[PDB]
Design a protein around this ligand. Sequence first.
Ligand SMILES: [Ca+2]
Ligand SMILES: [Ca+2]
Ligand SMILES: [Ca+2]
Ligand SMILES: [Ca+2]
Length: 141
Amino acid sequence: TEEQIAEFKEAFSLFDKDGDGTITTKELGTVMRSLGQNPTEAELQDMINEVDADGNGTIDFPEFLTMMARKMKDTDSEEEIREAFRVFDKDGNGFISAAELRHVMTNLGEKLTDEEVDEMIREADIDGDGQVNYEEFVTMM
Ligand SMILES: [Ca+2]
Ligand SMILES: [Ca+2]
Ligand SMILES: [Ca+2]
Ligand SMILES: [Ca+2]
């Protein structure tokens, strides 16, 4: 993960406009505006605060790094949950049905009856439409 780190250093350099090794609300502003966005000073301070740990008002690399790291983990986890969902969502329409769940499960070594998969679907069917969508899937696993 020694390379991840080099890429994070480069990402950070893009924010650190003058290269002192800290990111200010001013520099963040410049970056945001170069992206077509126009956050207020209040918004810039909020964005800085979400990463600025010791609260001295700016973001150093160790804080940036610590942030990017956590962010990537959740990014990867998120993708894996979605990959799992896709496997169960046989016809890929965005909803896991009892029939698909039964089918995929058996083809994965897990044999269940219609009654059992029904109970699993129900337990996760928050919006009550009869199948498990992605959001419900996440809330359940
Ligand atoms: Ca700077
Ligand atoms: Ca700081
Ligand atoms: Ca489906
Ligand atoms: Ca549902």
